[PDB]
Design a protein around this ligand. Structure first.
Ligand SMILES: *Cc1cc2c(cc1C)nc1c(=O)[nH]c(=O)nc-1n2C[C@H](O)[C@H](O)[C@H](O)COP(=O)(O)OP(=O)(O)OC[C@H]1O[C@@H](n2cnc3c(N)ncnc32)[C@H](O)[C@@H]1O
Ligand code: HEM
Ligand SMILES: CCCCCCO[C@@H]1O[C@H](CO)[C@@H](O)[C@H](O)[C@H]1O
Ligand SMILES: CC1=C(C(=O)Nc2ccccc2)SCCO1
Ligand SMILES: O=C([O-])CC(=O)C(=O)O
Ligand code: SF4
Ligand code: F3S
Ligand code: FES
Ligand SMILES: [K+]
Ligand SMILES: [K+]
Lengths: 101, 239, 613, 140
């Protein structure tokens, strides 16, 4: 019954989180932050592109198709980031290394 | 010593459908015309082309009839000063992204139906004593309606909202949502929760992305963007 | 015809007009169970009612103690005894109930410290039958009362199954045997012709201020309903009584509410003098409109006008606290800035008397039923009603009191509905009309559509407006009225030479404005001929060649031993006007004013007396 | 009498099958900084998202690990000016989106809605974006 306002509320909460993870990534690099960013970046992004789809895509089929695709992209994205955090240096460290060039 | 001003106006005749929409230029001597764009429009129709068509009624910006797009912005022609720079041509178009009936006349029927859909009338849990005594309202509670009840339903704001352009079939739009807020906070209305429940879907209220074109274009100086933000806050906290 | 597609509708009732009156009558019929149609040339909230400012009168007693019989008295005197006391009685007594209804609909009235409806002072209203000082009974929504009243009534109408035909232009009544059986109209969106058949028709089309060159009126106040009555061969009444509002803004003509004076504003001339203290020692700037307008006009005539052309005067509000201006008069504060570049907290507004409202209209009884007058007797026209500015009940007589019109709309809009419901039953059979009924309306419409004469519509309309402005203004005289009459008669004959250009049918405003011109001209002819015949001064009609009000007795002296004047020898009577539409010949007749109230014992009749403020 | 829902349906049935044109919108509406910033906030968000997705997919598909490509780049001894420029281009969209995003969250708290505040906050967001971006491009 309140799914719409709940979603709107969730989106803001996640946006806030991301905001806090920025400073956190700088002050406390490491797994905790690395995985949180992986989750927040994926979720904030999924919902955002979701809003973009709702605005511009119309027609029942085109919309279902567009949303199935987005869901596929989000899954792959979250997987790749976790994989990178696991088998490689991790997001926080990758950024510092990239900035040392 | 005339001051010839040029106006380029959108034209389309339903009775000669095949002729594509075009712009027609008219030359008007400002020394023999009132100061507002509507004055020029009426002068053109009375002296230069009586086929030019537009809605109008009050001449003082209270009826809402003459809304149109002048120099890129939606506004009321009857209160819009003509730009006296004779080197510039003023372009006049119908309200944006609307179906044109003829010339500057848009079809506002979806707009009115959206307004009807939010039940813009006082509802109390028990209406059987209606007509017997004045309902009491404090000065402080009445003041909450300032900035909301003055809307003249011209549709300048809604037709300036990109979201209403792309989703006007399901997005109620700024004018309607602000009137919904106006009944939500009327201390005499007892259906606030229900008014809020009606917006629990992805489009009615939520296509608003705080672009703020609506508030910038209102000829009455109102702020529907702010009103929409207040609804979102109530939607997030109500029980 | 055969060339225009015709659509037929059957309803229990048809209301022409969606202003305050039309809407109130329309949903009033629907709430009583009648299958009702409301035909309007404009989307409802665009009607002139939306522009009303000052307020609506009712003896609620929210500010000080009141009595509706005092409001009855102020209205009778204000009308200069041309008003029918039975209708005035009904209107003032029903006023408190009517305002409470609107507030219970949600109208956002301004509030007092007790949470009740805020009421302001207004022109020509007193306590204690004119003996006790200024009344404060004008209920308002700051200075946008009309806007709120109309939007509130429109929202309410959304709760009923009334069928609305928006942007449909009514052309004529469907008459048969002296009975009205509906109306024929043009659907502006698609060009089709529609016939609305119904046992009862309510005309709520507004006034005709647009017959003048300068007016506070909308471009759409063209007397279309009054003209339909005239074309059906029925009489209109008291059309020569035209109200000039004291304060239309100089130039634009936009109304500056009388609420300004109700809240303390004052009129001053070029010498800074508060001149109403001289014309109306007691009432001052809150004297009746006919008196303030004439006083302002004399100030200007006598050289004390302001501006480079010394052609207007000033309305001063800056001595008032800016919080009061913002709370009570925010609307005109904006308007003054937009149309005169004036900041009301610092400088005065330039103003001048401006055509504003029509006291005359279609004659009705106090129940809203349209009447005709045959062999010295009033007779009801079966199935025809009228309310609002288009009707002459007559609650306003020779001069309407500010804030009594919005009251008039809801009270009589409601009365028409009540009367029909206590007279007929929903579902009764719909009256018949000949198969070609309305054909002459369609032929006239086709004639203007293809008119290829020599005088375009805007040219003839401007001629009409300038003639009226300069031959039937605040002060009038026999020879100027006569030249005006002949001028209008010629302009009327010259309509044979009309020229239009738009040959389309969808939204052909070139055509609709030519139809409105024919309507305006019929109203104007009657106004000016009636004025020329009325050789006396009464309320808004001032003759400099006939300066006294002429009653059946000389009420300035004792009646004891006086010889009553024969009906044909005095002027306290309503003018009934008729027009032979093909020729334009105007015929004038007279009917008596009704002095009896609805109950002598509860509200006694007010005999004529000297009228002074 | 017709319900709001029936009116909306007839509205679309009537117009979609009519010859009425749709009045211009995007090609004639006058722009404003707030409107431009609005499209830009959407543009940066999408760019940022496609960036994260591309990186995520590169991590799952590329042969070598991250340090390897970092070293390869360092070995090319590219001009520090060019590298500074690239750092600026990388942090710009994220900085813009971040500051403007905060501007949005303040609106969601119902603050800053007066036209003057809307214009002012937008200009502040542009300055903060340029300062932080220039500060970070020169490393942190
Ligand atoms: C002009 C004016 C009048 C006025 C006022 C301010 C201004 C600027 N302020 C007032 C106030 O504060 N208090 C008050 O008592 N009166 C005030 N007035 C006068 C008063 O407002 C008017 O007399 C009153 O509004 C009358 O309204 P009414 O219901 O009689 O009609 P209307 O609003 O003018 O609307 C007319 C309707 O009829 C329709 N129409 C007209 N012709 C046709 C045709 N041909 N076919 C179909 N419909 C027709 C119009 O569409 C409209 O809906
Ligand atoms: C990394 C980030 C990525 C991948 C990203 C992506 C997105 C996307 C795709 C959108 C939708 C764009 C639109 O609808 O116009 C969006 C919107 C938004 N983002 Fe981000 N974002 C990031 C970080 C942040 C941060 C740090 C904040 C704070 C933030 C605040 C916002 C807000 C408030 C919105 C909602 C805008 C609105 O109200 O319409 N984002 N972001
Ligand atoms: C190409 C991107 C630049 C942004 C366009 C700025 O556009 C300007 O914005 C200001 C402030 O809102 C308005 O007052 C002006 O009328 C408008 O032209
Ligand atoms: C619908 C919407 C945007 C939009 O489409 N803006 C826009 C598009 C085209 C032309 C002007 C503005 S930008 C902010 C998110 O919401
Ligand atoms: O006509 C009226 O009754 C009142 C009006 O114009 C005003 O607000 O001054
Ligand atoms: S909010 Fe302003 S722009 Fe929108 S309809 Fe109302 S008056 Fe017109
Ligand atoms: S322009 Fe549109 S997106 Fe929201 S703030 Fe105004 S309704
Ligand atoms: S004509 Fe009434 S708002 Fe312009
Ligand atoms: K409430
Ligand atoms: K009247």
């Amino acid at each position: 019954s309140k799914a719409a306002s709940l979603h709107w509320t969730s989106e803001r909460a996640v946006s806030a989180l991301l905001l806090g993870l920025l400073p956190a990534a700088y002050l406390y690099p490491g797994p905790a932050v690395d995985y949180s960013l992986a989750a927040a970046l994926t979720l904030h992004g999924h919902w955002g592109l979701g809003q973009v789809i709702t605005d511009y895509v119309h027609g029942d089929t085109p919309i279902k198709v567009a949303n199935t695709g987005l869901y596929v992209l989000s899954a792959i994205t979250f997987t790749g980031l976790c994989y990178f955090n696991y088998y490689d240096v991790g997001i926080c460290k990758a950024v510092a290394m990239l900035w040392s060039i | 010593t005339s001051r010839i001003k040029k106006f380029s106006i959108y034209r389309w005749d339903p009775d000669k459908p095949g002729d594509k929409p075009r712009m027609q230029t008219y030359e008007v001597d400002l020394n023999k015309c009132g100061p507002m764009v509507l004055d020029a429009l009426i002068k053109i129709k009375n002296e230069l082309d009586s086929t030019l068509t537009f809605r109008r009624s009050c001449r003082e910006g209270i009826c809402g009839s003459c809304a149109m797009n002048i120099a890129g912005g939606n506004t009321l022609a009857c209160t819009k000063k003509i730009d006296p720079d004779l080197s510039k041509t003023t372009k006049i178009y119908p309200l944006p992204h609307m179906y044109v009936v003829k010339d500057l006349v848009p079809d506002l029927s979806n707009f009115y139906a959206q307004y009807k859909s939010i039940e813009p009338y006082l509802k109390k849990k028990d209406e059987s004593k209606q007509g017997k005594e004045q309902y009491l309202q404090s000065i402080e509670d009445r003041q909450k309606l300032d900035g909301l009840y003055e809307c003249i339903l011209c549709a300048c704001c809604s037709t300036s909202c990109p979201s209403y352009w792309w989703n006007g079939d399901k997005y109620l739009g700024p004018a309607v949502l602000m009137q919904a807020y106006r009944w939500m906070i009327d201390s005499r209305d007892d259906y606030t929760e229900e008014r809020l429940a009606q917006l629990q879907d992805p489009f009615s209220l939520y296509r608003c992305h705080t672009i703020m074109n609506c508030t910038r274009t209102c000829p009455k100086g109102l702020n529907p963007g702010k009103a929409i933000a207040e609804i979102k806050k109530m939607m997030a906290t109500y029980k | 015809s055969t060339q225009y597609p015709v659509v037929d509708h059957e309803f229990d009732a048809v209301v022409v007009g969606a202003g305050g009156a039309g809407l109130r009558a329309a949903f009033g019929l629907s709430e009583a169970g009648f299958n009702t149609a409301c035909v309007t040339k404009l989307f409802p909230t665009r009607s002139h009612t939306v522009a009303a400012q000052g307020g609506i009168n009712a003896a609620l007693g929210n500010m000080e103690d009141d009595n509706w019989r005092w409001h009855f008295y102020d209205t009778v005197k204000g009308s200069d005894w041309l008003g029918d006391q039975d209708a005035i009685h009904y209107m003032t007594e029903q006023a408190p109930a009517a305002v409470i209804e609107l507030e219970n609909y949600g109208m956002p009235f301004s509030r007092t410290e007790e949470g009740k409806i805020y009421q302001r002072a207004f022109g020509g209203q007193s306590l204690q039958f004119g003996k006790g000082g200024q009344a404060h009974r004008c209920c308002c929504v700051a200075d946008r009362t009309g806007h709120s009243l109309l939007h509130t009534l429109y929202g309410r109408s959304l709760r009923y199954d009334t069928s609305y035909f928006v942007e449909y232009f009514a052309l004529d009544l469907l008459m048969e045997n002296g009975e009205c059986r509906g109306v024929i109209a043009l659907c502006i969106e698609d060009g089709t012709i529609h016939r609305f058949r119904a046992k009862n028709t309510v005309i709520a089309t507004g006034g005709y201020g647009r017959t003048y060159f300068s007016c506070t009126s909308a471009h759409t106040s063209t007397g279309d309903g009054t003209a339909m009555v005239t074309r059906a061969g029925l009489p209109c009444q008291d059309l020569e009584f035209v109200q000039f509002h004291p304060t239309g803004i100089y130039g634009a003509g936009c109304l500056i509410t009388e609420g300004c004076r109700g809240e303390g504003g004052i009129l001053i001339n070029s010498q800074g003098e508060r001149f109403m203290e001289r014309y109306a020692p007691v009432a001052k700037d809150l004297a009746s409109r006919d008196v303030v307008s004439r006083s302002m006009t004399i100030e200007i005539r006598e050289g004390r006008g302001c501006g480079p052309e010394k052609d207007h005067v000033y309305l001063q509000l800056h001595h008032l606290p800016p919080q009061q201006l913002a709370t009570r008069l925010p609307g005109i504060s904006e308007t003054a800035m937009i149309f005169a570049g004036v900041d009301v907290t610092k400088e005065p507004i330039p103003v001048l008397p401006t055509v504003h409202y029509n006291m005359g209209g279609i004659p009705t009884n106090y129940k809203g039923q349209v009447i005709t007058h045959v062999n010295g007797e009033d007779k009801v026209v079966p199935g025809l009603y009228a309310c609002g500015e288009a009707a002459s009940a007559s609650v306003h007589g020779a001069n309407r009191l500010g804030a009594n019109s919005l009251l008039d709309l809801v009270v009589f809009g409601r009365a028409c509905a009540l009367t029909i419901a206590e007279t007929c039953k929903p579902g009764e059979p719909v009256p018949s009309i000949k198969p070609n009924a309305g054909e002459e309306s369609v032929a006239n419409l086709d004639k203007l559509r293809f008119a290829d004469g020599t005088i375009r519509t805007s040219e003839a309309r401007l001629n009409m407006q300038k003639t009226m402005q300069s031959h039937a203004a605040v002060f009038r005289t026999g020879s100027i009225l006569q030249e005006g009459c002949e001028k209008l008669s010629q302009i009327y004959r010259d309509l044979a030479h009309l020229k239009t250009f738009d040959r389309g049918i969808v939204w052909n405003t070139d055509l609709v404005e030519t139809l409105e011109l024919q309507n305006l001209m019929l109203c104007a002819l009657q106004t000016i001929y009636g004025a020329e015949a009325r050789k006396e001064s009464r309320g808004a009609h001032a003759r400099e060649d006939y300066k006294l009000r002429i009653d059946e007795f000389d009420y300035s002296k004792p009646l004891q031993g006086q010889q009553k004047r024969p009906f044909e020898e005095h002027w306290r009577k309503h003018t009934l006007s008729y027009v032979d539409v093909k020729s334009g010949k105007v015929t004038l007749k007279y009917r008596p004013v009704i002095d009896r109230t609805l109950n002598e014992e509860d509200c006694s009749s007010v005999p004529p007396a000297i009228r002074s403020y | 009498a017709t319900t709001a829902k029936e009116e909306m349906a007839r509205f679309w049935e009537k117009n979609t099958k009519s010859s009425r044109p749709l009045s211009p919108h995007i090609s004639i509406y006058k722009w404003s900084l707030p409107m431009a910033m609005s499209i830009t906030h959407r543009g940066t968000g999408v760019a940022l998202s496609l960036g994260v997705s591309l990186f995520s997919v590169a991590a799952l598909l590329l042969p070598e690990q991250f340090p390897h490509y970092v070293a390869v780049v360092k070995s090319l001894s590219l001009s520090p000016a060019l590298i500074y420029s690239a750092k600026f281009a990388l942090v710009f969209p994220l900085s813009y989106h971040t500051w403007n995003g905060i501007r949005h969250l303040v609106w969601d708290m119902g603050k800053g809605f007066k036209l003057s505040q809307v214009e002012q906050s937008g200009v502040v967001v542009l300055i903060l974006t340029l300062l932080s971006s220039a500060g970070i491009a020169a490393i942190s």
